[PDB]
Amino acid sequence: DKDVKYYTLEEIQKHKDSKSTWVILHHKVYDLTKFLEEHPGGEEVLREQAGGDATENFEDVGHSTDARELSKTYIIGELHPDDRSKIAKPSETL
């Protein structure tokens, strides 16, 4: 009973205060404003992203016992297709 709600890039970037913010993860939006105070133990959560090539080290371990990735119960919607390079030309993609 849920529908993916796409959010423009201006709305995902406008949220840059310090706590209430979201994070992209392979074409997707993660409203993790509560994740900051939901699992106190992993620092890479909403932190590992200084490079800017691909969010792969967003989370490894530190949940229950062998959780693959908590990234799933904190998503709000997906990324608008108007920004996804797949309409006129590829440019970034090849």
Side-chain angles (χ1 to χ4, degrees), residues 52-78:
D53 187 84
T55 39
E56 190 188 82
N57 283 62
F58 203 60
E59 212 213 58
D60 186 51
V61 72
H63 198 268
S64 258
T65 64
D66 286 307
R68 270 183 208 147
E69 214 87 302
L70 218 181
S71 36
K72 215 198 171 184
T73 26
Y74 291 110
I75 316 176
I76 32 152
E78 280 186 325

mmCIF file with all atom_site columns, all heavy atoms in Angstrom, residues 52-78:
data_model
loop_
_atom_site.group_PDB
_atom_site.id
_atom_site.type_symbol
_atom_site.label_atom_id
_atom_site.label_alt_id
_atom_site.label_comp_id
_atom_site.label_asym_id
_atom_site.label_entity_id
_atom_site.label_seq_id
_atom_site.pdbx_PDB_ins_code
_atom_site.Cartn_x
_atom_site.Cartn_y
_atom_site.Cartn_z
_atom_site.occupancy
_atom_site.B_iso_or_equiv
_atom_site.pdbx_formal_charge
_atom_site.auth_seq_id
_atom_site.auth_comp_id
_atom_site.auth_asym_id
_atom_site.auth_atom_id
_atom_site.pdbx_PDB_model_num
ATOM 1   N N   . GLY A 1 52 ? 32.355 10.395  -4.035 1.00 0.00 ? 52 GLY A N   1
ATOM 2   C CA  . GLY A 1 52 ? 31.303 10.919  -4.956 1.00 0.00 ? 52 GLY A CA  1
ATOM 3   C C   . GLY A 1 52 ? 31.291 10.091  -6.243 1.00 0.00 ? 52 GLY A C   1
ATOM 4   O O   . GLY A 1 52 ? 30.972 10.589  -7.306 1.00 0.00 ? 52 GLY A O   1
ATOM 5   N N   . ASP A 1 53 ? 31.637 8.832   -6.151 1.00 0.00 ? 53 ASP A N   1
ATOM 6   C CA  . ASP A 1 53 ? 31.649 7.963   -7.364 1.00 0.00 ? 53 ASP A CA  1
ATOM 7   C C   . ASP A 1 53 ? 30.549 6.905   -7.243 1.00 0.00 ? 53 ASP A C   1
ATOM 8   O O   . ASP A 1 53 ? 29.926 6.533   -8.221 1.00 0.00 ? 53 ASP A O   1
ATOM 9   C CB  . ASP A 1 53 ? 33.008 7.273   -7.484 1.00 0.00 ? 53 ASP A CB  1
ATOM 10  C CG  . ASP A 1 53 ? 33.083 6.517   -8.812 1.00 0.00 ? 53 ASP A CG  1
ATOM 11  O OD1 . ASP A 1 53 ? 33.404 7.142   -9.809 1.00 0.00 ? 53 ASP A OD1 1
ATOM 12  O OD2 . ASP A 1 53 ? 32.817 5.326   -8.809 1.00 0.00 ? 53 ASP A OD2 1
ATOM 13  N N   . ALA A 1 54 ? 30.309 6.420   -6.052 1.00 0.00 ? 54 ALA A N   1
ATOM 14  C CA  . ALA A 1 54 ? 29.251 5.386   -5.857 1.00 0.00 ? 54 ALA A CA  1
ATOM 15  C C   . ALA A 1 54 ? 29.125 5.061   -4.366 1.00 0.00 ? 54 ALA A C   1
ATOM 16  O O   . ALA A 1 54 ? 30.091 4.702   -3.719 1.00 0.00 ? 54 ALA A O   1
ATOM 17  C CB  . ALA A 1 54 ? 29.630 4.118   -6.625 1.00 0.00 ? 54 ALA A CB  1
ATOM 18  N N   . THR A 1 55 ? 27.941 5.185   -3.823 1.00 0.00 ? 55 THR A N   1
ATOM 19  C CA  . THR A 1 55 ? 27.741 4.886   -2.375 1.00 0.00 ? 55 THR A CA  1
ATOM 20  C C   . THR A 1 55 ? 27.801 3.373   -2.154 1.00 0.00 ? 55 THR A C   1
ATOM 21  O O   . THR A 1 55 ? 26.792 2.693   -2.189 1.00 0.00 ? 55 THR A O   1
ATOM 22  C CB  . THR A 1 55 ? 26.375 5.414   -1.930 1.00 0.00 ? 55 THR A CB  1
ATOM 23  O OG1 . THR A 1 55 ? 25.425 5.194   -2.963 1.00 0.00 ? 55 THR A OG1 1
ATOM 24  C CG2 . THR A 1 55 ? 26.475 6.911   -1.634 1.00 0.00 ? 55 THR A CG2 1
ATOM 25  N N   . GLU A 1 56 ? 28.976 2.845   -1.927 1.00 0.00 ? 56 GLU A N   1
ATOM 26  C CA  . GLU A 1 56 ? 29.113 1.376   -1.702 1.00 0.00 ? 56 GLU A CA  1
ATOM 27  C C   . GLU A 1 56 ? 29.510 1.116   -0.247 1.00 0.00 ? 56 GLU A C   1
ATOM 28  O O   . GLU A 1 56 ? 29.172 0.095   0.322  1.00 0.00 ? 56 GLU A O   1
ATOM 29  C CB  . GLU A 1 56 ? 30.192 0.816   -2.633 1.00 0.00 ? 56 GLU A CB  1
ATOM 30  C CG  . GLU A 1 56 ? 30.164 -0.713  -2.587 1.00 0.00 ? 56 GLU A CG  1
ATOM 31  C CD  . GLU A 1 56 ? 31.359 -1.269  -3.363 1.00 0.00 ? 56 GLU A CD  1
ATOM 32  O OE1 . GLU A 1 56 ? 32.438 -1.319  -2.795 1.00 0.00 ? 56 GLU A OE1 1
ATOM 33  O OE2 . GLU A 1 56 ? 31.175 -1.637  -4.511 1.00 0.00 ? 56 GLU A OE2 1
ATOM 34  N N   . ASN A 1 57 ? 30.225 2.032   0.355  1.00 0.00 ? 57 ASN A N   1
ATOM 35  C CA  . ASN A 1 57 ? 30.648 1.846   1.774  1.00 0.00 ? 57 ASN A CA  1
ATOM 36  C C   . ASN A 1 57 ? 29.695 2.609   2.697  1.00 0.00 ? 57 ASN A C   1
ATOM 37  O O   . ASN A 1 57 ? 30.097 3.135   3.718  1.00 0.00 ? 57 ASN A O   1
ATOM 38  C CB  . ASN A 1 57 ? 32.070 2.380   1.955  1.00 0.00 ? 57 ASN A CB  1
ATOM 39  C CG  . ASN A 1 57 ? 33.071 1.375   1.382  1.00 0.00 ? 57 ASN A CG  1
ATOM 40  O OD1 . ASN A 1 57 ? 33.055 1.090   0.201  1.00 0.00 ? 57 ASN A OD1 1
ATOM 41  N ND2 . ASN A 1 57 ? 33.948 0.822   2.174  1.00 0.00 ? 57 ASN A ND2 1
ATOM 42  N N   . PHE A 1 58 ? 28.436 2.671   2.343  1.00 0.00 ? 58 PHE A N   1
ATOM 43  C CA  . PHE A 1 58 ? 27.448 3.397   3.194  1.00 0.00 ? 58 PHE A CA  1
ATOM 44  C C   . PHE A 1 58 ? 27.206 2.606   4.481  1.00 0.00 ? 58 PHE A C   1
ATOM 45  O O   . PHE A 1 58 ? 26.928 3.170   5.523  1.00 0.00 ? 58 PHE A O   1
ATOM 46  C CB  . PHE A 1 58 ? 26.130 3.547   2.432  1.00 0.00 ? 58 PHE A CB  1
ATOM 47  C CG  . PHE A 1 58 ? 25.351 4.710   2.995  1.00 0.00 ? 58 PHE A CG  1
ATOM 48  C CD1 . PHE A 1 58 ? 25.900 5.998   2.971  1.00 0.00 ? 58 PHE A CD1 1
ATOM 49  C CD2 . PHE A 1 58 ? 24.079 4.502   3.540  1.00 0.00 ? 58 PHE A CD2 1
ATOM 50  C CE1 . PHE A 1 58 ? 25.177 7.077   3.493  1.00 0.00 ? 58 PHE A CE1 1
ATOM 51  C CE2 . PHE A 1 58 ? 23.356 5.581   4.062  1.00 0.00 ? 58 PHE A CE2 1
ATOM 52  C CZ  . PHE A 1 58 ? 23.904 6.869   4.039  1.00 0.00 ? 58 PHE A CZ  1
ATOM 53  N N   . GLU A 1 59 ? 27.311 1.302   4.414  1.00 0.00 ? 59 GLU A N   1
ATOM 54  C CA  . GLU A 1 59 ? 27.090 0.463   5.628  1.00 0.00 ? 59 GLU A CA  1
ATOM 55  C C   . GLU A 1 59 ? 27.647 -0.940  5.386  1.00 0.00 ? 59 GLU A C   1
ATOM 56  O O   . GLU A 1 59 ? 27.495 -1.501  4.317  1.00 0.00 ? 59 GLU A O   1
ATOM 57  C CB  . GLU A 1 59 ? 25.589 0.373   5.919  1.00 0.00 ? 59 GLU A CB  1
ATOM 58  C CG  . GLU A 1 59 ? 25.368 0.269   7.429  1.00 0.00 ? 59 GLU A CG  1
ATOM 59  C CD  . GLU A 1 59 ? 24.139 -0.600  7.706  1.00 0.00 ? 59 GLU A CD  1
ATOM 60  O OE1 . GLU A 1 59 ? 24.133 -1.738  7.269  1.00 0.00 ? 59 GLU A OE1 1
ATOM 61  O OE2 . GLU A 1 59 ? 23.225 -0.111  8.350  1.00 0.00 ? 59 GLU A OE2 1
ATOM 62  N N   . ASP A 1 60 ? 28.293 -1.510  6.372  1.00 0.00 ? 60 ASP A N   1
ATOM 63  C CA  . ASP A 1 60 ? 28.866 -2.878  6.209  1.00 0.00 ? 60 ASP A CA  1
ATOM 64  C C   . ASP A 1 60 ? 28.280 -3.807  7.274  1.00 0.00 ? 60 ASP A C   1
ATOM 65  O O   . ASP A 1 60 ? 27.547 -4.728  6.970  1.00 0.00 ? 60 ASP A O   1
ATOM 66  C CB  . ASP A 1 60 ? 30.388 -2.816  6.367  1.00 0.00 ? 60 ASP A CB  1
ATOM 67  C CG  . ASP A 1 60 ? 30.990 -4.185  6.045  1.00 0.00 ? 60 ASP A CG  1
ATOM 68  O OD1 . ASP A 1 60 ? 30.677 -4.717  4.994  1.00 0.00 ? 60 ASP A OD1 1
ATOM 69  O OD2 . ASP A 1 60 ? 31.755 -4.678  6.858  1.00 0.00 ? 60 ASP A OD2 1
ATOM 70  N N   . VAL A 1 61 ? 28.600 -3.569  8.522  1.00 0.00 ? 61 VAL A N   1
ATOM 71  C CA  . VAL A 1 61 ? 28.068 -4.433  9.615  1.00 0.00 ? 61 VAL A CA  1
ATOM 72  C C   . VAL A 1 61 ? 27.748 -3.557  10.839 1.00 0.00 ? 61 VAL A C   1
ATOM 73  O O   . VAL A 1 61 ? 28.093 -2.390  10.879 1.00 0.00 ? 61 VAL A O   1
ATOM 74  C CB  . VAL A 1 61 ? 29.116 -5.515  9.956  1.00 0.00 ? 61 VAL A CB  1
ATOM 75  C CG1 . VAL A 1 61 ? 30.310 -4.903  10.698 1.00 0.00 ? 61 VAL A CG1 1
ATOM 76  C CG2 . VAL A 1 61 ? 28.478 -6.597  10.830 1.00 0.00 ? 61 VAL A CG2 1
ATOM 77  N N   . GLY A 1 62 ? 27.095 -4.110  11.829 1.00 0.00 ? 62 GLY A N   1
ATOM 78  C CA  . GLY A 1 62 ? 26.754 -3.314  13.045 1.00 0.00 ? 62 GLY A CA  1
ATOM 79  C C   . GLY A 1 62 ? 25.234 -3.263  13.214 1.00 0.00 ? 62 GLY A C   1
ATOM 80  O O   . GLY A 1 62 ? 24.669 -2.226  13.506 1.00 0.00 ? 62 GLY A O   1
ATOM 81  N N   . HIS A 1 63 ? 24.572 -4.378  13.031 1.00 0.00 ? 63 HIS A N   1
ATOM 82  C CA  . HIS A 1 63 ? 23.087 -4.405  13.179 1.00 0.00 ? 63 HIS A CA  1
ATOM 83  C C   . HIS A 1 63 ? 22.624 -5.843  13.422 1.00 0.00 ? 63 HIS A C   1
ATOM 84  O O   . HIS A 1 63 ? 22.788 -6.706  12.582 1.00 0.00 ? 63 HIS A O   1
ATOM 85  C CB  . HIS A 1 63 ? 22.438 -3.870  11.901 1.00 0.00 ? 63 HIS A CB  1
ATOM 86  C CG  . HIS A 1 63 ? 21.011 -3.489  12.185 1.00 0.00 ? 63 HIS A CG  1
ATOM 87  N ND1 . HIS A 1 63 ? 19.960 -4.374  12.005 1.00 0.00 ? 63 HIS A ND1 1
ATOM 88  C CD2 . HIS A 1 63 ? 20.445 -2.323  12.636 1.00 0.00 ? 63 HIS A CD2 1
ATOM 89  C CE1 . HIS A 1 63 ? 18.827 -3.733  12.343 1.00 0.00 ? 63 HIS A CE1 1
ATOM 90  N NE2 . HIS A 1 63 ? 19.066 -2.478  12.735 1.00 0.00 ? 63 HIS A NE2 1
ATOM 91  N N   . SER A 1 64 ? 22.048 -6.103  14.570 1.00 0.00 ? 64 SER A N   1
ATOM 92  C CA  . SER A 1 64 ? 21.567 -7.480  14.892 1.00 0.00 ? 64 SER A CA  1
ATOM 93  C C   . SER A 1 64 ? 22.768 -8.437  14.970 1.00 0.00 ? 64 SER A C   1
ATOM 94  O O   . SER A 1 64 ? 23.338 -8.626  16.028 1.00 0.00 ? 64 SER A O   1
ATOM 95  C CB  . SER A 1 64 ? 20.568 -7.950  13.827 1.00 0.00 ? 64 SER A CB  1
ATOM 96  O OG  . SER A 1 64 ? 19.246 -7.826  14.336 1.00 0.00 ? 64 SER A OG  1
ATOM 97  N N   . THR A 1 65 ? 23.160 -9.043  13.870 1.00 0.00 ? 65 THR A N   1
ATOM 98  C CA  . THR A 1 65 ? 24.322 -9.980  13.903 1.00 0.00 ? 65 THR A CA  1
ATOM 99  C C   . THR A 1 65 ? 24.983 -10.024 12.523 1.00 0.00 ? 65 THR A C   1
ATOM 100 O O   . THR A 1 65 ? 26.182 -9.864  12.396 1.00 0.00 ? 65 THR A O   1
ATOM 101 C CB  . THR A 1 65 ? 23.835 -11.383 14.280 1.00 0.00 ? 65 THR A CB  1
ATOM 102 O OG1 . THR A 1 65 ? 22.956 -11.863 13.272 1.00 0.00 ? 65 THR A OG1 1
ATOM 103 C CG2 . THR A 1 65 ? 23.098 -11.329 15.618 1.00 0.00 ? 65 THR A CG2 1
ATOM 104 N N   . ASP A 1 66 ? 24.207 -10.239 11.492 1.00 0.00 ? 66 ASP A N   1
ATOM 105 C CA  . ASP A 1 66 ? 24.781 -10.296 10.115 1.00 0.00 ? 66 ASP A CA  1
ATOM 106 C C   . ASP A 1 66 ? 23.861 -9.545  9.148  1.00 0.00 ? 66 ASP A C   1
ATOM 107 O O   . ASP A 1 66 ? 23.610 -9.991  8.043  1.00 0.00 ? 66 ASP A O   1
ATOM 108 C CB  . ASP A 1 66 ? 24.906 -11.757 9.676  1.00 0.00 ? 66 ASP A CB  1
ATOM 109 C CG  . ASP A 1 66 ? 26.078 -12.412 10.410 1.00 0.00 ? 66 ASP A CG  1
ATOM 110 O OD1 . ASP A 1 66 ? 27.168 -11.869 10.350 1.00 0.00 ? 66 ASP A OD1 1
ATOM 111 O OD2 . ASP A 1 66 ? 25.864 -13.448 11.019 1.00 0.00 ? 66 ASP A OD2 1
ATOM 112 N N   . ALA A 1 67 ? 23.360 -8.407  9.557  1.00 0.00 ? 67 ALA A N   1
ATOM 113 C CA  . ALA A 1 67 ? 22.456 -7.618  8.668  1.00 0.00 ? 67 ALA A CA  1
ATOM 114 C C   . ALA A 1 67 ? 23.220 -7.186  7.415  1.00 0.00 ? 67 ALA A C   1
ATOM 115 O O   . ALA A 1 67 ? 24.278 -6.590  7.497  1.00 0.00 ? 67 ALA A O   1
ATOM 116 C CB  . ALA A 1 67 ? 21.962 -6.378  9.417  1.00 0.00 ? 67 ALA A CB  1
ATOM 117 N N   . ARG A 1 68 ? 22.690 -7.486  6.256  1.00 0.00 ? 68 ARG A N   1
ATOM 118 C CA  . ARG A 1 68 ? 23.376 -7.099  4.989  1.00 0.00 ? 68 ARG A CA  1
ATOM 119 C C   . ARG A 1 68 ? 23.455 -5.574  4.896  1.00 0.00 ? 68 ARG A C   1
ATOM 120 O O   . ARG A 1 68 ? 24.511 -5.012  4.673  1.00 0.00 ? 68 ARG A O   1
ATOM 121 C CB  . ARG A 1 68 ? 22.589 -7.643  3.795  1.00 0.00 ? 68 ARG A CB  1
ATOM 122 C CG  . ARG A 1 68 ? 23.099 -9.042  3.443  1.00 0.00 ? 68 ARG A CG  1
ATOM 123 C CD  . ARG A 1 68 ? 22.366 -9.554  2.201  1.00 0.00 ? 68 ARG A CD  1
ATOM 124 N NE  . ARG A 1 68 ? 22.315 -11.043 2.234  1.00 0.00 ? 68 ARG A NE  1
ATOM 125 C CZ  . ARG A 1 68 ? 21.286 -11.672 1.735  1.00 0.00 ? 68 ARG A CZ  1
ATOM 126 N NH1 . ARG A 1 68 ? 20.233 -11.891 2.475  1.00 0.00 ? 68 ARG A NH1 1
ATOM 127 N NH2 . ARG A 1 68 ? 21.309 -12.080 0.496  1.00 0.00 ? 68 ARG A NH2 1
ATOM 128 N N   . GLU A 1 69 ? 22.344 -4.903  5.065  1.00 0.00 ? 69 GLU A N   1
ATOM 129 C CA  . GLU A 1 69 ? 22.343 -3.413  4.987  1.00 0.00 ? 69 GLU A CA  1
ATOM 130 C C   . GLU A 1 69 ? 21.008 -2.875  5.509  1.00 0.00 ? 69 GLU A C   1
ATOM 131 O O   . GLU A 1 69 ? 19.959 -3.179  4.976  1.00 0.00 ? 69 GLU A O   1
ATOM 132 C CB  . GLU A 1 69 ? 22.534 -2.978  3.532  1.00 0.00 ? 69 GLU A CB  1
ATOM 133 C CG  . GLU A 1 69 ? 23.341 -1.679  3.488  1.00 0.00 ? 69 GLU A CG  1
ATOM 134 C CD  . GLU A 1 69 ? 24.835 -2.006  3.469  1.00 0.00 ? 69 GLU A CD  1
ATOM 135 O OE1 . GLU A 1 69 ? 25.290 -2.661  4.393  1.00 0.00 ? 69 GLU A OE1 1
ATOM 136 O OE2 . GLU A 1 69 ? 25.499 -1.597  2.532  1.00 0.00 ? 69 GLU A OE2 1
ATOM 137 N N   . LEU A 1 70 ? 21.045 -2.078  6.547  1.00 0.00 ? 70 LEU A N   1
ATOM 138 C CA  . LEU A 1 70 ? 19.783 -1.515  7.110  1.00 0.00 ? 70 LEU A CA  1
ATOM 139 C C   . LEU A 1 70 ? 19.084 -0.642  6.060  1.00 0.00 ? 70 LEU A C   1
ATOM 140 O O   . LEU A 1 70 ? 17.892 -0.415  6.134  1.00 0.00 ? 70 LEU A O   1
ATOM 141 C CB  . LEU A 1 70 ? 20.105 -0.660  8.342  1.00 0.00 ? 70 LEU A CB  1
ATOM 142 C CG  . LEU A 1 70 ? 19.023 -0.853  9.414  1.00 0.00 ? 70 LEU A CG  1
ATOM 143 C CD1 . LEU A 1 70 ? 19.350 0.024   10.622 1.00 0.00 ? 70 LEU A CD1 1
ATOM 144 C CD2 . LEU A 1 70 ? 17.652 -0.448  8.859  1.00 0.00 ? 70 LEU A CD2 1
ATOM 145 N N   . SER A 1 71 ? 19.816 -0.144  5.090  1.00 0.00 ? 71 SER A N   1
ATOM 146 C CA  . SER A 1 71 ? 19.201 0.726   4.035  1.00 0.00 ? 71 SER A CA  1
ATOM 147 C C   . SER A 1 71 ? 17.996 0.022   3.398  1.00 0.00 ? 71 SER A C   1
ATOM 148 O O   . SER A 1 71 ? 18.133 -0.740  2.460  1.00 0.00 ? 71 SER A O   1
ATOM 149 C CB  . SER A 1 71 ? 20.242 1.022   2.955  1.00 0.00 ? 71 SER A CB  1
ATOM 150 O OG  . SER A 1 71 ? 21.065 -0.121  2.770  1.00 0.00 ? 71 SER A OG  1
ATOM 151 N N   . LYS A 1 72 ? 16.818 0.279   3.908  1.00 0.00 ? 72 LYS A N   1
ATOM 152 C CA  . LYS A 1 72 ? 15.589 -0.362  3.353  1.00 0.00 ? 72 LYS A CA  1
ATOM 153 C C   . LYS A 1 72 ? 14.375 0.117   4.151  1.00 0.00 ? 72 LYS A C   1
ATOM 154 O O   . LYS A 1 72 ? 13.325 0.389   3.600  1.00 0.00 ? 72 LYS A O   1
ATOM 155 C CB  . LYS A 1 72 ? 15.702 -1.886  3.464  1.00 0.00 ? 72 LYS A CB  1
ATOM 156 C CG  . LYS A 1 72 ? 15.022 -2.538  2.258  1.00 0.00 ? 72 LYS A CG  1
ATOM 157 C CD  . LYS A 1 72 ? 14.734 -4.008  2.567  1.00 0.00 ? 72 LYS A CD  1
ATOM 158 C CE  . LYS A 1 72 ? 13.851 -4.598  1.466  1.00 0.00 ? 72 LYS A CE  1
ATOM 159 N NZ  . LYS A 1 72 ? 13.494 -6.002  1.815  1.00 0.00 ? 72 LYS A NZ  1
ATOM 160 N N   . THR A 1 73 ? 14.515 0.221   5.450  1.00 0.00 ? 73 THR A N   1
ATOM 161 C CA  . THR A 1 73 ? 13.384 0.678   6.299  1.00 0.00 ? 73 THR A CA  1
ATOM 162 C C   . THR A 1 73 ? 13.510 2.183   6.570  1.00 0.00 ? 73 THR A C   1
ATOM 163 O O   . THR A 1 73 ? 12.983 2.689   7.544  1.00 0.00 ? 73 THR A O   1
ATOM 164 C CB  . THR A 1 73 ? 13.415 -0.083  7.628  1.00 0.00 ? 73 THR A CB  1
ATOM 165 O OG1 . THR A 1 73 ? 14.741 -0.509  7.913  1.00 0.00 ? 73 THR A OG1 1
ATOM 166 C CG2 . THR A 1 73 ? 12.496 -1.299  7.542  1.00 0.00 ? 73 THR A CG2 1
ATOM 167 N N   . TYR A 1 74 ? 14.195 2.902   5.714  1.00 0.00 ? 74 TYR A N   1
ATOM 168 C CA  . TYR A 1 74 ? 14.349 4.374   5.916  1.00 0.00 ? 74 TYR A CA  1
ATOM 169 C C   . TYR A 1 74 ? 14.277 5.088   4.562  1.00 0.00 ? 74 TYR A C   1
ATOM 170 O O   . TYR A 1 74 ? 14.785 6.183   4.406  1.00 0.00 ? 74 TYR A O   1
ATOM 171 C CB  . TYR A 1 74 ? 15.704 4.666   6.567  1.00 0.00 ? 74 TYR A CB  1
ATOM 172 C CG  . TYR A 1 74 ? 15.709 4.163   7.993  1.00 0.00 ? 74 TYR A CG  1
ATOM 173 C CD1 . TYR A 1 74 ? 16.483 3.049   8.342  1.00 0.00 ? 74 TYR A CD1 1
ATOM 174 C CD2 . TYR A 1 74 ? 14.941 4.813   8.967  1.00 0.00 ? 74 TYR A CD2 1
ATOM 175 C CE1 . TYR A 1 74 ? 16.489 2.587   9.663  1.00 0.00 ? 74 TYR A CE1 1
ATOM 176 C CE2 . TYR A 1 74 ? 14.947 4.349   10.287 1.00 0.00 ? 74 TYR A CE2 1
ATOM 177 C CZ  . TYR A 1 74 ? 15.720 3.236   10.635 1.00 0.00 ? 74 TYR A CZ  1
ATOM 178 O OH  . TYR A 1 74 ? 15.725 2.778   11.937 1.00 0.00 ? 74 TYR A OH  1
ATOM 179 N N   . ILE A 1 75 ? 13.656 4.477   3.581  1.00 0.00 ? 75 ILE A N   1
ATOM 180 C CA  . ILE A 1 75 ? 13.558 5.120   2.235  1.00 0.00 ? 75 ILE A CA  1
ATOM 181 C C   . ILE A 1 75 ? 12.242 5.892   2.134  1.00 0.00 ? 75 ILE A C   1
ATOM 182 O O   . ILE A 1 75 ? 11.254 5.536   2.750  1.00 0.00 ? 75 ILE A O   1
ATOM 183 C CB  . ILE A 1 75 ? 13.600 4.053   1.132  1.00 0.00 ? 75 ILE A CB  1
ATOM 184 C CG1 . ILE A 1 75 ? 14.700 3.026   1.436  1.00 0.00 ? 75 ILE A CG1 1
ATOM 185 C CG2 . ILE A 1 75 ? 13.894 4.727   -0.210 1.00 0.00 ? 75 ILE A CG2 1
ATOM 186 C CD1 . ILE A 1 75 ? 14.667 1.907   0.391  1.00 0.00 ? 75 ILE A CD1 1
ATOM 187 N N   . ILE A 1 76 ? 12.224 6.943   1.358  1.00 0.00 ? 76 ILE A N   1
ATOM 188 C CA  . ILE A 1 76 ? 10.972 7.750   1.199  1.00 0.00 ? 76 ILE A CA  1
ATOM 189 C C   . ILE A 1 76 ? 10.424 7.575   -0.215 1.00 0.00 ? 76 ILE A C   1
ATOM 190 O O   . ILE A 1 76 ? 9.228  7.485   -0.420 1.00 0.00 ? 76 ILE A O   1
ATOM 191 C CB  . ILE A 1 76 ? 11.235 9.248   1.446  1.00 0.00 ? 76 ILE A CB  1
ATOM 192 C CG1 . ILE A 1 76 ? 12.658 9.644   1.012  1.00 0.00 ? 76 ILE A CG1 1
ATOM 193 C CG2 . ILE A 1 76 ? 11.055 9.556   2.931  1.00 0.00 ? 76 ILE A CG2 1
ATOM 194 C CD1 . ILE A 1 76 ? 12.691 11.119  0.600  1.00 0.00 ? 76 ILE A CD1 1
ATOM 195 N N   . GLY A 1 77 ? 11.291 7.533   -1.191 1.00 0.00 ? 77 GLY A N   1
ATOM 196 C CA  . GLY A 1 77 ? 10.830 7.371   -2.601 1.00 0.00 ? 77 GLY A CA  1
ATOM 197 C C   . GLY A 1 77 ? 12.035 7.108   -3.506 1.00 0.00 ? 77 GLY A C   1
ATOM 198 O O   . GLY A 1 77 ? 13.020 6.529   -3.087 1.00 0.00 ? 77 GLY A O   1
ATOM 199 N N   . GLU A 1 78 ? 11.964 7.533   -4.744 1.00 0.00 ? 78 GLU A N   1
ATOM 200 C CA  . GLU A 1 78 ? 13.105 7.312   -5.680 1.00 0.00 ? 78 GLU A CA  1
ATOM 201 C C   . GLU A 1 78 ? 13.576 8.659   -6.236 1.00 0.00 ? 78 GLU A C   1
ATOM 202 O O   . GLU A 1 78 ? 13.101 9.706   -5.835 1.00 0.00 ? 78 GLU A O   1
ATOM 203 C CB  . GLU A 1 78 ? 12.659 6.413   -6.835 1.00 0.00 ? 78 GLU A CB  1
ATOM 204 C CG  . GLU A 1 78 ? 12.665 4.954   -6.377 1.00 0.00 ? 78 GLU A CG  1
ATOM 205 C CD  . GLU A 1 78 ? 12.357 4.043   -7.567 1.00 0.00 ? 78 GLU A CD  1
ATOM 206 O OE1 . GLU A 1 78 ? 11.565 4.444   -8.405 1.00 0.00 ? 78 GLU A OE1 1
ATOM 207 O OE2 . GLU A 1 78 ? 12.918 2.961   -7.621 1.00 0.00 ? 78 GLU A OE2 1
#
